[PDB]
Amino acid sequence: DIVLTQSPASLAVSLGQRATISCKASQSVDYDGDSYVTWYQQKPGQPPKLLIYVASNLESGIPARFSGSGSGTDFTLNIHPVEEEDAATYYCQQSNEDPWTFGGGTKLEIKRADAAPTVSIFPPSSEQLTSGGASVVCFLNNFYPKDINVKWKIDGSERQNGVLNSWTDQDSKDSTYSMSSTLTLTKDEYERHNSYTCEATHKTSTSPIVKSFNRNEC
Amino acid sequence: DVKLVESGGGLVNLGGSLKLSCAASGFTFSRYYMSWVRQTPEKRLELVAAINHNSGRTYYSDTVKGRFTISRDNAKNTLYLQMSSLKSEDTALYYCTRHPLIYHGNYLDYWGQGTTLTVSSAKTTPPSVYPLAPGSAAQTNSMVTLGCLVKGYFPEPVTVTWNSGSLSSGVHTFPAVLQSDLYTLSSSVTVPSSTWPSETVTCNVAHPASSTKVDKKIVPR
């Protein structure tokens, strides 16, 4: 088999700038005037599209901002200038030897300005407590640098068991990221404490963004 | 225009079996090489199997050789993947793929939408859909955020809508995370504050494997 390793795994490039994605092959793939390497673009929830074939042939319809090159064991994809809708995971595929092999793919993050998350916190619904469960939900929406930190504090005591976090794919419209963090525990556990606090730290603030409610207050 | 639409996927047990289908249109199907390629939960792609225009030649990856069978009917413009002795590792989204003619175009010219395969002992389970509303001492700015918590379902996927589409531009639906053996995800929406009291906001939640569908109006506290 021909292992196809793609570095880096993610790359962040600003609108206008150049992105370059590498595809290194464990053995040579160049069958004479043709190196059989394909590039594919996949937007999340979308099916991949053919970008470039036989190393450097632009497939019909794709913008000239996408180009391909390379020989032997080293291959390369370039996009330049990068524009909004290039947010995607790009793949390289070998096809000179069976089995046809793919690279693990490289995500292209669009680089925009810093933006701080909008944080919101949500008590367990009556309807969940009724079933004997309690989840507290916190939303960190529309932020940039993907990098963040969430602290979940209970009565001013950091807690971490029962916390489930998810990240959305970069936003097509505004290129921001978003995350949810959900603390789960049983109803009885929920009922032994007063203050539930979601704290967010982001490189755009030294002051954490702190959002809380009291189970006892109103 | 070339179009490939695949089907027949869903949950199946270990050792189990299931046949996938891919329906083709917009091109002379009998001329083309055809393949199945699968994408794992962790986004790696792998060609499981391929077949030529006349069924004279078939290829299988070594991990599926002897368990899978690829076929085609040129009259019906359909391709098939017969799977058996299913392993957990087979769990993926399966695309069917067209090859261009004669090393002309790219070695995979066109892909379908994928159909999902889940091999697992765990059982099909619908979700609980809890409403996420702010406490009565809520965040009174120009906009307010609301949500639904879709918890304890299996397998993927779920779909979440808000007022049946009308609120699309302020919705974030977060990818699911797996716990004991159950997926939980969430979904937020933002709406002008001056709207939430007096106006309905409703998350529409469907889970196709269980034919579930529930709509939860978000009610203040």
Side-chain angles (χ1 to χ4, degrees):
Chain A
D1 295 41
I2 301 162
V3 183
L4 288 183
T5 315
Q6 280 184 243
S7 57
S10 73
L11 187 58
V13 165
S14 301
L15 298 188
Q17 292 168 7
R18 183 205 172 190
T20 163
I21 293 157
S22 43
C23 179
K24 158 103 184 194
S26 77
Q27 288 110 324
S28 100
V29 179
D30 268 287
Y31 182 109
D32 295 351
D34 298 340
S35 216
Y36 276 164
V37 163
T38 301
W39 295 88
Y40 297 112
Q41 181 192 39
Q42 177 168 59
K43 295 159 187 212
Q46 279 216 334
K49 287 189 196 145
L50 166 61
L51 289 171
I52 274 154
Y53 58 84
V54 181
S56 87
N57 293 282
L58 201 80
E59 156 75 347
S60 176
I62 308 302
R65 314 172 7 247
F66 287 85
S67 62
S69 51
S71 163
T73 71
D74 294 66
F75 304 90
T76 280
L77 172 58
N78 276 257
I79 163 168
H80 195 205
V82 163
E83 290 181 30
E84 312 180 36
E85 290 130 302
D86 302 350
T89 24
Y90 296 89
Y91 290 82
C92 64
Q93 176 220 8
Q94 159 88 8
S95 55
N96 174 52
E97 180 174 281
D98 288 353
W100 286 20
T101 33
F102 292 83
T106 294
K107 187 121 224 199
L108 173 79
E109 165 185 332
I110 286 184
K111 216 203 171 178
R112 46 155 300 117
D114 275 0
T118 289
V119 197
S120 302
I121 193 176
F122 293 97
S125 64
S126 276
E127 343 186 307
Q128 184 186 7
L129 299 171
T130 307
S131 70
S135 289
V136 196
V137 189
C138 181
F139 283 139
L140 292 79
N141 290 341
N142 306 299
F143 69 89
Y144 195 77
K146 192 180 193 191
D147 193 48
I148 215 155
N149 184 326
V150 290
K151 270 163 183 200
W152 263 116
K153 287 187 193 170
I154 293 181
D155 282 337
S157 96
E158 265 163 285
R159 280 201 199 167
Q160 179 242 334
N161 302 303
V163 170
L164 282 165
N165 304 306
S166 194
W167 272 264
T168 185
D169 283 307
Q170 181 158 42
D171 203 308
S172 73
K173 266 152 185 193
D174 66 6
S175 305
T176 181
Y177 291 99
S178 279
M179 163 187 160
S180 59
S181 179
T182 59
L183 173 68
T184 72
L185 34 24
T186 73
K187 165 158 154 165
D188 56 64
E189 299 296 348
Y190 181 73
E191 295 195 346
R192 293 171 195 177
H193 309 289
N194 300 337
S195 183
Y196 289 83
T197 300
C198 183
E199 296 185 11
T201 290
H202 193 244
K203 309 190 218 181
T204 308
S205 62
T206 305
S207 43
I209 303 173
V210 189
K211 236 71 181 179
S212 61
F213 71 90
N214 272 54
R215 216 201 79 251
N216 35 354
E217 289 185 12
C218 250
Chain B
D1 253 303
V2 171
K3 293 200 185 216
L4 294 179
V5 175
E6 50 281 81
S7 79
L11 177 69
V12 179
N13 261 279
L14 322 190
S17 63
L18 201 79
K19 160 170 133 187
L20 313 186
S21 294
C22 162
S25 53
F27 67 95
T28 302
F29 187 73
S30 53
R31 302 187 73 199
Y32 295 90
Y33 227 95
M34 293 301 312
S35 57
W36 290 92
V37 173
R38 83 189 169 177
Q39 187 176 7
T40 306
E42 39 171 61
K43 306 288 179 231
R44 302 171 201 190
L45 296 166
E46 179 212 1
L47 170 72
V48 295
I51 192 161
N52 76 336
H53 72 289
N54 74 358
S55 309
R57 219 187 327 144
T58 69
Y59 170 82
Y60 298 97
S61 58
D62 69 338
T63 41
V64 318
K65 212 197 178 209
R67 297 191 302 114
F68 283 30
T69 298
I70 206 193
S71 295
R72 73 192 286 141
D73 193 284
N74 291 351
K76 288 182 183 179
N77 292 185
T78 56
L79 185 80
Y80 308 105
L81 193 66
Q82 181 73 69
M83 314 182 269
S84 67
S85 298
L86 281 168
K87 304 170 189 163
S88 62
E89 284 227 357
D90 300 324
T91 311
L93 181 83
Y94 285 67
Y95 300 99
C96 65
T97 49
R98 188 225 213 197
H99 303 234
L101 293 197
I102 316 160
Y103 320 149
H104 138 88
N106 192 304
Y107 248 0
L108 307 163
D109 197 354
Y110 286 111
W111 303 61
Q113 302 293 356
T115 290
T116 306
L117 178 65
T118 313
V119 177
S120 177
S121 56
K123 304 305 177 193
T124 294
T125 312
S128 314
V129 187
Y130 306 119
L132 307 174
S136 65
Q139 197 221 337
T140 310
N141 278 327
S142 105
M143 301 288 303
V144 296
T145 301
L146 305 157
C148 287
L149 172 56
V150 317
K151 180 176 185 160
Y153 73 91
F154 187 87
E156 288 279 28
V158 151
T159 298
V160 186
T161 293
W162 285 88
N163 291 356
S164 309
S166 41
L167 301 172
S168 36
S169 47
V171 175
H172 300 264
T173 303
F174 301 86
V177 188
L178 182 69
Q179 307 193 43
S180 54
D181 250 308
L182 292 173
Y183 290 98
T184 309
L185 74 67
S186 51
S187 176
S188 74
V189 173
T190 319
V191 168
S193 311
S194 72
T195 283
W196 164 221
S198 32
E199 300 287 310
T200 296
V201 176
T202 304
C203 73
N204 295 20
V205 176
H207 177 228
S210 69
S211 300
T212 326
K213 190 222 159 164
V214 189
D215 303 344
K216 191 69 226 184
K217 185 174 186 181
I218 284 127
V219 194
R221 310 173 146 251

